[PDB]
Ligand binder design. Structure first.
Ligand code: IFM
Ligand code: NA
Length: 437
């Protein structure tokens, strides 16, 4: 059993589900630009329509209610709120989210709002985006405006989702928007994301009409050397630094990890910033999908660490399944780092889901995925980890970034042609598991 007041939710992000990309004054985001660039998305799709949740968030609410959830993690689209990124507000964007928040509260669903889930306004990108310190400042101003208007009703806020992705996939590996490919630009982006976050936490506390519970959401990948050789151990530490400690340590008031500063060398970004980054948080969100079993790869791009596949583990449509990594990473946070309480702000999986002849979606491996990770959460809780909720990624099938509409993570199936949603078997399992609490 979980605590009686445990938060039980599902998660989405605005660009992945909303559609209506030009409606009601919305500006252009980097993902509008990126998905409309030939060859950036695997299947030729965009977020232009997606799940049409701009218009259909009522149906999404109906799903959450049918699942017996008590919370919904979703993001606010910065391009709807300040269409030019730096500039005037768009009250019609704020009013949309206001109505949505009221609909959620009316349904008994607590909103866990993400300010930034990757949809940087394009005019900011045109001035270097996360490569520019001014972007941090104006992110903080956006955070101020949203909290002034919604913070009477929404207490739980996350500044960023997965700054590692925004910086390293967006500016270093080039697979996410805006599609840059330079290490130094990636690392500069990571700094300005973190500064942005810190400036926003301060801004939000000053703007808020009541005390808030502010967090950040990080993807964390527990890393394990494939052997105990100095080479493989070092590769594990480098990957662990590249993904996890690079963000955890400055958030914790510890500066950037020195081993990584040494390794990155001249690519590393340029005390006062560090203080701001460490603005005290009320909680930390963990997004957990996979481990990294690392071998040294001296000829690879930094961090010169490659995955050693294990064919004996299960795999989904896109990842290796390793539930025990969730326990490991939570125990580490609890014992080694100062953030508390913690929320699992995402966990879930992608499969080749189809509507069967009976009308159901028989996604047994996703059911087994939830059951296995929830069992690891019970262990973590038994160890004293201060965990206060769990959000399944995703409420519904959606626009999965560079993989487009083709990679389905929902607990609900989305027919992208009709926009009809249907609960999958794993969604019914969650329903009935949550009810039994
Ligand atoms: O790839 C699965 C998910 C990982 N976390 C961020 C989400 O936007 C994404 O869909
Ligand atoms: Na498989």
């Amino acid at each position: 059993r979980f605590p009686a007041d445990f938060v039980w939710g599902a998660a989405t992000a605005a660009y992945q589900i909303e559609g209506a990309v030009r409606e009601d004054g919305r500006g252009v985001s980097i993902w509008d630009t990126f998905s409309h660039t030939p060859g950036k998305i695997a299947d030729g799709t965009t977020g232009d329509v997606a799940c049409d949740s701009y218009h259909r968030y009522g149906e999404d609410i109906g799903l959450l209610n049918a699942l017996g959830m008590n919370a919904y993690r979703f993001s606010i689209a910065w391009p709807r709120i300040v269409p030019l990124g730096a500039g005037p507000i768009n009250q019609a964007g704020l009013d949309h989210y206001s109505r949505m928040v009221d609909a959620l509260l009316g349904a008994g669903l607590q909103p866990f709002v993400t300010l930034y889930h990757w949809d940087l306004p394009q005019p900011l990108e045109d001035r270097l985006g996360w490569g520019s310190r001014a972007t941090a400042t104006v992110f903080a101003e956006y955070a101020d405006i949203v909290v002034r208007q919604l913070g009477d009703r929404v207490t739980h806020w996350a500044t960023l989702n997965e700054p590692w992705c925004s910086a390293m996939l967006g500016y270093y590996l080039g697979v996410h928007a805006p599609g840059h490919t330079d290490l130094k630009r990636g690392l500069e982006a990571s700094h300005n994301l973190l500064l942005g976050h810190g400036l926003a936490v301060q801004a939000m506390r000053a703007a808020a009409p009541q005390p808030l519970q502010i967090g950040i959401v990080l993807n964390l990948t527990p890393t394990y050397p494939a052997s105990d050789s100095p080479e493989d151990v070092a590769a594990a530490r480098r990957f662990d630094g590249f993904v996890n400690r690079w963000f955890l340590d400055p958030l914790a008031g510890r500066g950037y990890p020195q081993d990584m500063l040494d390794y990155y060398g001249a690519a590393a970004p340029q005390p006062e910033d560090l203080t701001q980054i460490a603005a005290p948080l009320d909680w930390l969100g963990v997004n957990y999908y996979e481990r990294m079993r690392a071998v040294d790869a001296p000829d690879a791009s930094l961090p010169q660490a490659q995955r050693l596949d294990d064919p004996d583990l299960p795999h989904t449509a896109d990842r290796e399944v390793y539930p025990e990594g969730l326990y490991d990473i939570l125990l580490r946070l609890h014992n080694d780092y100062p953030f508390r309480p913690l929320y699992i702000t995402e966990n879930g999986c992608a499969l080749h889901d189809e509507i069967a002849e009976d009308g159901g979606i028989h996604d047994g491996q996703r059911q087994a995925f939830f059951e296995a990770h929830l069992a690891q959460l019970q262990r973590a809780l038994a160890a004293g980890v201060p965990l206060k909720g769990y959000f399944a990624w995703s409420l519904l099938d959606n626009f999965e970034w560079a993989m487009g509409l083709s990679m389905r993570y929902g607990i609900c199936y989305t027919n992208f042609e009709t926009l009809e949603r249907r609960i999958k078997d794993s969604g019914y399992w969650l329903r009935d598991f949550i009810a039994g609490q």
